[PDB]
Every structure is written in C-alpha cells, then in structure tokens.
C-alpha cells in the first residue's frame, strides 16, 4: 500500500499555525484529531498539496519517494461542505467526474461499468436515478449526498484518500454508517486519512492511527488503542462512561499546559520509534473541446432544473412588454410623438441594463466548486469560463430582447420596415451582453454578492444620467462631456433613436406655405436628432454597436484574468 | 421553591407533535433530552406559555396552583440564537432590560445596583463596558454573549428560568463553564429547565432530573442518575467509555421501537410514583412614553454604531448632488431649458423613491427580537412602531433631500426665490417618507427580504411610467388614466414642475412683434404645464402634497395592523 511519511513539518502563513509535526500514515483508517483551533484541516491540506508550498518547510514523502507532480490527480480529497450539484441526478454527477477525470482513450462503456461498480460499493444503486437535492426539495438524504462526494473521488480508484470532517451535521447513525463504509474501503488496502470533531467511542474503536493536534503542536502520534495507555502513563486518568476522545480534549483544554504535553510526547517511546522509521525511509488528460462540452452540459442541466430565475425573467419580460404596448399603443406623429417615442426607447434600454445585475451570481455562487475542481485537475479555467458563458449568459440574455421587440414593435406602431426591426433586436441584445459582461468583470473572484450589486447599481445610475434623454448632452461642459463615452445606455439609446426618428414628421398640417415653423418647433426627426447631438450618417448607428462590442470584449477578458489570477490553494 | 407539574399533556398543531407527557420539575437543574425531531423545544415553550393555548390539552400547574396570567413576566426564557444587540455595550443591554422590565416606581440607583449584582454573579464585570459584538468585530466571546442573555432574563430575579439549547455552537470548555454557572444558580433554590443536544458526561453528571422525548413520547422521566439503571433493567447495557447520553439516543434510534420504550416506561415504577405525586398535587408595568423613550434610545445607538448604511447613504447623496450640479450647471432659458429642467427634477424624484427600498430591512431584520420582547412583556407594539420610526426612518430619509437641494439649487440656477427653495425641500422629503412608508407596509411581518425588494422595484417602475415625463398623461386612454393617481413620483414631479416652470420664458429674442410663435413652440412655462395636464392654480402644488400625506398615513397604519396581527406565539 501507500505510506505517506511527513517529517519535521513547519508551515508559516509570520504566524506559524503548525510548529513541528512528524509521523507516518500507514495503510488503514488513519485519523487526525484535536480542537477546532488546532491545525488539523491545515495539516490535511498540506499533505494533499492543497496549500501554498511557500510556507511549507518540511519533507513530505510517499512510499519512499517525493510527491509526484500529478499527485492531486491520483489522490482524492473530500471537502467538508458537499459541492455536488443538487439539480442533477447522482449518476449524472458521477458521470461528469468519470468523463473528465478518467482518460479520454477509454470507451464510454468502460466508464459506465466503473460508475456502476462504485455505486454498488457505496450502496447508492437505490438513488442512482434520483435528484441529489436542490435543498428546496431533497431527492436523497444527507448521508447519500456525502457518499456521492466520496464516489466522485473514488471513480479514479485512488490509492490515497483524504477527507475533511466526514461526520459533521450528520446524525449519529448516518455518521456510524459512513465510517463503517470507510473501514470497509480501508480493509481493501486503501490508505484513508481524515479529520473529525468529537467522535463517539463506537467510531473511535475503529481507528488504526491517531494524530492529536492542539495550537499547532503534536500531542500524540501512534496507534489509537495505545493513546489511552500513553496518557494514563502521563498521569491523567479517564473515568469510565467517558468517551476517551473527550478525555483527550479535556486534557488539552486543561480541564502553558499544551507545551508540557508536547514535551512529554517528544520524550515518549512512540516518537523515538517513529523518528527512527522516518530516518530509515529517508535513507491535462482531456482536450479543450471535451471539457467545454461537459461543463456546458452540466450548466444547462442546472439552468433547466432551477426554474425560478429563468421563468421569472421570461414572465416579467412578457408582462412588461404587454403593459408598455398598451400604454404607448398607437404612437402618433403629433406634438406628443417625440416624448413617447424617446421615453419607451429609454425604458427598454434601462430595463436591459438594470436587469443584468443578476449576473453577479453566475460565478459568485460556484466559487468553491470551481476552485475544488480546478485544483483536482478536472478542467482548465478557459473551458470553465467559455462553457459557463455559452450555457447561462448567452440564451437568457438574448431572449428578453426578442420578446420585447416582437411584442411592442407592432402594438406601438414604430417604423414598419424590417431592417429597423432587426436593428432594434440586435442593439438590445448587445446592450444586455455588454452590461452582463461588466457585471461579470466586477463580480468575478468574489464570495460576497452585496457589494457587487451596490456597485453595479451605482454605475448604472451614473450611466443613465448621461443618456440623451435627461441631460441634452450638447449642453454639458467640455471638462465633463468625455464621461458620456463610458455609458452603455447612451450607445443603445442613440442607436434606437437614429433607427426610428429618421424620416418622421411631427408637425401635422404645417402646409409649408408660410414655410415658417418658428425654428422652435422640432417639426422633423432629423432636427430633433441634430439638436440632441446625434449624427444622421449611417456611421452613427454602427459606431454605437462597435463600441458596445469592444466593451464586451474588454470586460470578458478582465473577468478571465481575474479568475486565472485567483487564489486557488 | 417552585414545583412545575405538567400532567397528561397533548398538543395538536392535526399532527400531534406531543402525545402524552406527565412529570414534575422540582427545584434544581432539571433537563430535557432527545433527538432533534423530538418535541423538546416544543415542550419547553408549552411550559413557558410561548405556544398557542389552542392546541394544548393538559393541566400545567405550578406550586399547586394554575399558571398565573402574569407568568411570562415573572419567568425568564433564553432563546437559542442570542438576540442581544451587538452595537451596544453589555451594561447597556442589561440597563435596557432593567428599565423596561423592573417597575417604574423604583429609582435608577436601585436598578443600577441590581445590574451590578447580576454582572457580579455571571462574572461579566470584566466586559461590562465592552461592545457585545457586531459580528463584524467581536468585543466579547460567545460565552459572554450567552451569559449576557441569561443576565437580561435574571434581572427581575426570576424563580423559574427556562433555557433552549444553552450549549450549541459553544466550545466544550465554554459549555462546561455555562452549565457550571447554571448549577451554581440552581444551588440557590432557582428551578432551571433546559434542553440540550448530545451532552458530555461531565455535563450529564450534574443533572437532577431527566426527561427523554422521542417522536413526541415520554421514554423516561426521573432522576438522571437512575436512568442508566432503568435502561439496564430494560436489558440494554452500556459499554464503558461510552457517554450515557449517547447510549440513550442509540437505544431510541434502534442502534416500532419507540412505542415499545414508551410502554416500558408506563409499566415502570418511576411513572407510578410521579403519577401519584401529580394526583396528590391536583388534590404593562411602564407607561407608554417610557417605553418609547427607551426603545428609541436603543435604536439610535444601533444606528450610530453601524455606520455602513448611514454613511454610504450620505456619501452617495453628496456625490450625486455634485455630479448633477456639474452636468446641469447653468440652466439656460433657451430651447434646451425645458428638457434639462424636467430631466433633473425627474431624476431627483426617482432617486428619492428608489433609494427607499432599503427600508424593508427596518422590521425584517429584527423580527425575532421584537417577538421575543413582546411576549416577555417589555413593551407594546405601538411604542415599538413609533420609536423605531422616530429613530430610524425620520432623520435618514429627511437628510438626503436637504443635501440634494442645498447642493444643486444654486449650481443649477433654478428659481432664486426662497419660497420655491423650501417647497422643493418639503416636497422631496414627503416623497421619501411616502415611499419608505409603502416599503414598510409591504415588508412588515416578513422574515424574507428578497420578495419584498422585487415587489418594491416592480411597483416603482410602474409608478415611474405614469410620471409626466415619459408618457404625456393627457394622451393616455380614459380606461387607464385613473392609475396615474396611485403614483408617488407623479405628485412630487408635478409639484416641482409647478414650482419651477411658472413665470419662465424659453423663446429668446421672440420680440412678440409678429406675435406668432407658430403655436408649436412652447415659448412659456405655463404653456408647457397646461400641455402636460398640470393646473396653474396654487391648489395643484398643495393637492399633490396632500395626497402624499394621505398615502403616508394609510401605509403606516397598514404596517401597524400587520405587526399587531402577527403570529406571536
Ligand atoms: C448606499 O447608497 C445607496 C444604496 C442603495 C440604494 C441607494 C443608495 O443611494 C442613492 C438603493 N438601492 C436600491 C437597490 C435597487 C436595485 C435595483 C433596482 N431596480 C432599478 O433600478 C430599475 C429596474 C428597471 O427594470 C427592472 C428599470 O426599468 C426602467 C429602471 C430601474 N431603475 C431606475 O430607473 C433608477 C433611477 N434612479 C435610481 C437611484 C438610486 C438607486 C436606483 C435607481 C434606479 C432598484 C433599486 C439599494 C441600496
Ligand atoms: N490562509 C490562512 N491565513 C491565515 N490563517 C490561517 C489560514 N489558514 C489557516 N489559518 C489559521 O490556522 C488555524 C487552524 O485552523 P484550521 O484549518 O485547523 O481550522 P479547523 O476549525 O480546525 O478546520 P475544520 O473546519 O476542519 O474544523 C486557525 O487559527 C487559522 O486562523
Ligand atoms: N408552528 C409549527 N407548525 C408546524 N409544525 C411545528 C411547529 N412547531 C413545531 N413543529 C414540529 O414539531 C417538531 C418538533 O420540533 P422542535 O421544536 O423539537 O425542533 P428542535 O430541533 O427539537 O428544536 P431545537 O432548535 O431546540 O433543536 C418538528 O418536527 C416540527 O415540524
Ligand atoms: C476599461 C473600460 C472602461 C473599457 C472602456 C472602453 C471605452 C471607453 C472605449 C472602448 C471602445 C471605444 C470606442 C471605439 C470606437 C469608437 C469610434 C470613434 O469614431 C468614436 C469613439 C468610439 C465610439 C470609441 C469610444 C470609447 C470606447 C467605447
Ligand atoms: C390602499 C393604498 C393604495 C392607498 C392608495 C390611496 C390613494 C389611491 C388615494 C389616497 C388619498 C387620495 C387623494 C385624496 C385627495 C385628492 C384630491 C382630489 O381633488 C383629486 C384626487 C386626490 C389627489 C386623491 C387621489 C387618490 C389618493 C392619493
């Protein structure tokens, strides 16, 4: 089997969370234990290479050789809080893990067989076709979600398996079942390493090695059955009916003292034996397209499975379209035509911009999962980015524009030509994409959403002021005019105006015989446009669209760089 | 001491969470134990009268007499999740509790002495002058927050003290310290009643009575020390090094069975003895002004202590004011004057309306605390409502209007008279108050905020469309025009227009010699107003303000009725 032998570890983050730690984790159900403040999860990550190598200051050595570069890929790790996708079926999650982790050369049949074997081992065949739990509804119980995570890691038939708090939040019976399962797995020769919180003695009866850590020091390392003898030799005695694990924790808590216990251990025989043994010992798979395909499939399944956001979006869009069609129904080429036309176009543009502050949740929600799967070697960050965009951002931002136009354009009696119709659709879509892209660039690489939302709203108000309606941009001062070139709504609104007002007459019965509209009348659309600053040449419309495209590219690239320079360790 | 003797309890919510429960809770450290699904907190609330009496179907009797009407006031209850105010100092929270609970007749000196005694008993004198923990920063540790809650309840020197999960989320040492404190309190003759989750044997060694509940049935009731003997007599045996509490939970879990255990208990000697004993036994302070003063003081201290919301509000308001002053600087009486003036007024109005969707959090956040203190008899709901409004809603909604006007009115070159200036200020304030009041009426009596926020935004968009700028209300159809009378921004915007445009000329160099402005020019403000539907008489402005006031009153009354008919039990 595998023999993971740490030695003289010291990790500096210059607070030193772990001071001096040596041991050997032979095959079996090895364990790590101690108070919450003690560096147990930290040590676990150190052994699994999930922590920045800079602070590390010791020699980790497996089976007599230094850790291979591909270690994380050939050794599983199970996070504390399950990251499985509730909106998917158990077998679907295992299938995703199998498809990306296992080699491409293998056939789909072999991978399906392996998945069946794993489900059989973990006893999940009952729920192999059930939802894993949206947490709005729970297709499976907590224990089965945990077993599913363990299965995802087990797909590649790992030799070394790390776990963090495998029994936390579970009921006593569920925890016992999980740990008995781990004991069965270890009997096969698989080295299991894990951390726990105040285990029961039925659980503690099953261990093969113990590692007790407090304030970053090694109180004990050796066979669990003999830990009680060691402490009793130290003088501390355990009354019956008291769980020995709690007894160790009491001894640590003093119910300073901790350094005294460390000194005792260094004087111990176990330490000498372990040190002698240590000195004796010292003596991507897949292509880009495949990753993109699979992550996009998973994202779309989640998108469908969670109907709240999508369905609410479509319904609100339709209702707004119908209401606006009723209110602005039958626009007239009279004194009030200009007001209503500009108003509706402004409203549509702002609705597209302000309805995209819900894109912050795209990457904020799935930060932990992305980090875990990137470290574990599932996929690159490029494939995650493009697949997630192509599955979530593209369709649900393209739809509202189509709904709005199809509903309003004919109820409102806007221009009857088709070239104008599709320009309206394209312009609204580009506004939505650019706004959502900006939201991504602002929200990417963040775990808190509120700050991002506030920032987006503030930015959008300051953009809205510089839209043509409220301010008459020709009037703004020169030292402030240049900010108008940073506004998405300005480009969209200007394009829509240039599409609609051109070739419209708003002075009925002028008769042009006196030929005097007083020069204060705004009797034509061209005149209104030039008075608002717009350009009547065909270049104006297309330059607005061009600017929107450039903003899209800029913001998406920023988001990618923010993900690629995120702290993943 | 006190002797709380329940008997033949049965509670129906017609799922019957509690089936049949009898016992006697003599003075000391009585306890309630069992699985999470078991009705332990439910039984606790039943005994403390925190549950609707309708479902209850048994006789609760204290010291031989039925529960007095003023029981909740003379018996403390400690909620699971601490409700203390982080933004206050420990002694301040205890002072608030002392001021409202203790009688008015007492002097302040006596109440201060009592507070000092309580702090001395609980050993909080060290942190008597420290912040209780915003959870952005923690002035005190979790154990001290818990001790503070217990002190708030202890102020009135209660005879009967109920607790719920006093050790959940605490560390082992902290939990032991808390329970040892409770043991010290009980040694003085105070009946303590509480519920716990998987206690340690060091804790379990301290009890005086035990009540084991599973699936709403009484597995055991008697001395804790003898529970192990009872179960061993039943046949189930406990291996050493196993916590007896976990042993009982295992027996319940089967590691149906539960009904079998209930049958055993009914056959037991303890049940017969308890039944015989039971049959033998059966054989506002303060004035309104005081409550208002104290709750308002606490609310203002919290408002100051948490600077995020307030300071961000002021800063954003100032920045917007300066930006708008720069952009619209020097309004001119030319063709573009009308556009810019209407735009800025519309923007200010909408900013006041849309910045008030942050008032939903006023009562949403503090629902649990309000319910707890109302049941416990601290204050009426009227005083809470008025004090909370008078402390939070009034000043922070009045300030932005003043900032906006003082900043913009002179940079923009609006009307130079003062009567107009103060009308602008008053109108903006009333808009803010009415909008916040509507948000309260929508959010009061809710624990989820997101739905309220979405509703508020939707309402405000539909209000905005019917503002005069985008739609030319004179044009809307008759069967839809009547909705314009439900819009706050319409009233505010109309009032501002009527204040500004009156007596303004927007056609420079007309010379009035030809006297022909083409009738399409809008050469005067009065003409613009009449074309938009407004009335030039003085009544229009004041009727808009009147409507806003009526909306304020309506919505506030609705909020009060929603709080007064909330489910507090
Ligand atoms: C610290 O400082 C501040 C903090 C906060 C606020 C204000 C502050 O300081 C002031 C107010 N927060 C409100 C959060 C929020 C989010 C989304 C919306 N929903 C739309 O905004 C909208 C949606 C449309 O369709 C869905 C639409 O279609 C036409 C037009 C829309 N909005 C406008 O037109 C408009 C105009 N002015 C505004 C001024 C301030 C805030 C929002 C404004 C919105 C509204 C409010 C919360 C925190
Ligand atoms: N990246 C980091 N930066 C600063 N301090 C850290 C970092 N990682 C760990 N620490 C410190 O190391 C100590 C050990 O924390 P540890 O990881 O053991 O938490 P834990 O509660 O034991 O984990 P678990 O959630 O499994 O119980 C903590 O006091 C923590 O402040
Ligand atoms: N108001 C209510 N309406 C419907 N069911 C209720 C209500 N109150 C309690 N119950 C039911 O009673 C059962 C007992 O819940 P209980 O109050 O014991 O929760 P608990 O987890 O034991 O409390 P704690 O948070 O202290 O652990 C639950 O199954 C719950 O569904
Ligand atoms: C880092 C962030 C702010 C990106 C900001 C990029 C903005 C300011 C840039 C991106 C592309 C740019 C546009 C590219 C093309 C043209 C056509 C030209 O004849 C007028 C300016 C105009 C319309 C530019 C305005 C400024 C612009 C929109
Ligand atoms: C229950 C909720 C919706 C409260 C809604 C109340 C609204 C619709 C009511 C409250 C007071 C009312 C106003 C009372 C007085 C006047 C003066 C009158 O010459 C024109 C109508 C006008 C301006 C009313 C319009 C409708 C109004 C604003």
UniProtKB/Swiss-Prot annotation, chains A, B:
Tell me, what's a Pfam family for it? ABC_tran
What one GO molecular function would you report for this record? ATP binding
Changing residue 107 to M has the effect of: Decreased protein abundance; no effect on localization to the plasma membrane; no effect on substrate transmembrane transport; decreased ATPase activity; no effect on ATPase-coupled transmembrane transporter activity
List the residue(s) that the UniProt entry marks as the site Not glycosylated: 333, 472
The outcome of changing residue 518 to A is: Strongly reduced binding to hemin but not to PPIX
Q: What is the effect of changing residue 336 to A?
A: No effect on protein abundance; no effect on substrate transmembrane transport
The record places domain ABC transmembrane type-2 at 304-566
Q: What is the effect of changing residue 520 to A?
A: No effect on hemin binding
Effect on the protein of changing residue 397 to D: Decreases ATPase activity
Q: How does it assemble?
A: Homodimer; disulfide-linked. The minimal functional unit is a homodimer, but the major oligomeric form in plasma membrane is a homotetramer with possibility of higher order oligomerization up to homododecamers.
Q: What is this protein called?
A: Broad substrate specificity ATP-binding cassette transporter ABCG2
Which source organism? Homo sapiens (Human)
């Amino acid at each position: 089997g595998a023999v993971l032998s740490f030695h003289n570890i010291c990790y500096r983050v210059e607070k030193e969370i772990l001071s001096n730690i040596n041991g050997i984790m032979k095959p079996g159900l090895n364990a790590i234990l101690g108070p919450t403040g003690g560096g147990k999860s930290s040590l676990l990550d150190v052994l699994a290479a999930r922590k920045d190598p800079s602070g590390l200051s010791g020699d980790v050595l497996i089976n007599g050789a230094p850790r291979p570069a591909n270690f994380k890929c050939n050794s599983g790790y199970v996070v504390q809080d399950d990251v499985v996708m509730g909106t998917l079926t158990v077998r679907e999650n295992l299938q995703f893990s199998a498809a990306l982790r296992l080699a491409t050369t293998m056939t789909n049949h072999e991978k399906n067989e392996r998945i069946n074997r794993v489900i059989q081992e973990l006893g999940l065949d009952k729920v192999a076709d059930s939802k894993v739990g949206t947490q709005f509804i729970r297709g499976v119980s907590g224990g089965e979600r945990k077993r599913t995570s363990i299965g995802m890691e087990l797909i590649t038939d790992p030799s070394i398996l790390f776990l963090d708090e495998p029994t936390t939040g579970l009921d006593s019976s569920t925890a016992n079942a999980v740990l008995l399962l781990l004991k069965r797995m270890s009997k096969q020769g698989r080295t299991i390493i894990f951390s726990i919180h105040q285990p029961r003695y039925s659980i503690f009866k099953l261990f093969d090695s113990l590692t007790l850590l407090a304030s970053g020091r090694l109180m004990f390392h050796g066979p669990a059955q003999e830990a009680l003898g060691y402490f009793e030799s130290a003088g501390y005695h355990c009354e019956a009916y008291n769980n020995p694990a709690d007894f160790f924790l009491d001894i640590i808590n003093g119910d300073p003292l901790i350094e005294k216990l460390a000194e005792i251990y260094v004087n111990s025989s176990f330490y000498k034996e372990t040190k002698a043994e240590l000195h004796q010992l010292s003596g991507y798979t897949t292509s880009f397209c495949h990753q993109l395909r699979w992550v996009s499939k998973r994202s779309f399944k989640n998108l469908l499975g969670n109907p709240q956001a999508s369905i609410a979006q479509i319904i609100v869009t339709v209702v707004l379209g119908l209401v606006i069609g009723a209110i602005y129904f039958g626009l007239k080429n009279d004194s009030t035509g200009i007001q209503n036309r500009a108003g509706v176009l402004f409203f549509l543009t702002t609705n597209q911009c302000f309805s995209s502050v819900s894109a912050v949740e795209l990457f904020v929600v799935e930060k932990k999962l992305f980090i875990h799967e990137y470290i574990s070697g599932y996929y690159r960050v490029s494939s995650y980015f493009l697949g997630k965009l192509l599955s979530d951002l593209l369709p649900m931002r393209m739809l509202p524009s189509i709904i709005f136009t199809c509903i309003v354009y004919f109820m409102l009696g806007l221009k009857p030509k088709a070239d104008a119709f599709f320009v309206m659709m394209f312009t609204l879509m580009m506004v939505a994409y650019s706004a959502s892209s900006m939201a991504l660039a602002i929200a990417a690489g963040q775990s808190v959403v509120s700050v991002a939302t506030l920032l987006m709203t503030i930015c959008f108000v300051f953009m809205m002021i510089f839209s043509g309606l409220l301010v008459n941009l020709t009037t703004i001062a020169s030292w402030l005019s240049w900010l108008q070139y940073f506004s998405i709504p300005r480009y969209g609104f200007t394009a829509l105006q240039h599409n609609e007002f051109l070739g419209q007459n708003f002075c009925p019965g002028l008769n042009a015989t006196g030929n005097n509209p007083c020069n204060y009348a705004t009797c034509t659309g061209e005149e209104y446009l030039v008075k608002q600053g717009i350009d009547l040449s065909p270049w104006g419309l297309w330059k607005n669209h061009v600017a929107l495209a450039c903003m899209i590219v800029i913001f998406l690239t920023i988001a990618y760089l923010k993900l690629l320079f995120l702290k993943k360790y």
